[PDB]
Design a protein around this nucleic acid. Sequence first.
DNA 1: GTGGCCGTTTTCTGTCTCGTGCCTGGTGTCTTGGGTGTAATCC
Length: 315
Amino acid sequence: CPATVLRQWCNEFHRWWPPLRVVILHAIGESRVKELIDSVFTRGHVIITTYVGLRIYSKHLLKRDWGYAILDEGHKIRNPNSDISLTCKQLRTPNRVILSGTPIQNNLTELWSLFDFIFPGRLGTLPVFQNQFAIPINVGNLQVQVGYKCAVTLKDLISPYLLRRVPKKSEMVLFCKLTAPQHALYEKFLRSDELSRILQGKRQVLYGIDILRKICNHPDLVDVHAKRRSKKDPTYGSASKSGKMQVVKKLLELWKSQGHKTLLFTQTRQMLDILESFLERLNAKGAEEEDFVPFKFLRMDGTTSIGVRQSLVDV
DNA sequence: GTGGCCGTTTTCTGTCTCGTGCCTGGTGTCTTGGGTGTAATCC
């Protein structure tokens, strides 16, 4: 189980079934873990492990036989060929159960790799799994019917191996335009040597679409002095240059006076600096004048500690 | 509140030489004939 539910997983054991003994894979539940191993198979009933902690004591875990196997992680297995398979699929037990309602999110290769852990391959090998129906599903008449049967065969083959069970919502998508300073920086980066250099193969496209998203968030994020002016230059953020501040200012102020607890969502902690300078400036403007209320934001990320979590989640 | 590592998202005329290949002058090895030689047999 993840490290965010470690105590939780021991808790239901304690409350529902006290007769079941339990031992987490930590300093308690290099010799000390070996005395822990002493009578962890006869006396010990259930062993708990964080899915980072197996490769801390795997020397004396993967060796002996095991019974029932539970893994509460269906998005940290995904596709094959990773440390996942290295420390997981070497377990010695038919009983293999995964607890996750989102196993399929990227591709059917993840499906094959997840089916491998539970069953020894009722479908076939990875080359077999691919050559069977990988391309036909993607491309697809000339595809549908043969593809229809080749897919329903898979559905009947794996269906008795994974269970499936399922106010209102408004999805308004606004299509804003690139500003003129944005279009200039877009064309400048558009016609440059680095893009072709990435395309031919010396680099990866992952570093050329991260920088063209770096300009869409706002112009001032493709600067070389990003860290040098992120939190010590009160002009780094700015407004109306991003092409989205106006549909941010208007949309957030339509709820600020309306009193609607709203969620602002990003992906980068670097753009958090800009949206945080922006909202501090909004706070300054509101506080200087009257008939208003402080914006009162907060930012949470991996920089903070695991202890904080729920607290802010609650506040 | 310090970091470790994995996990992740996409598809230079200029001149010379060194070597050799080709042409040629020599030279081997031979073939024909021509006379010398013997045969020889008419009568």
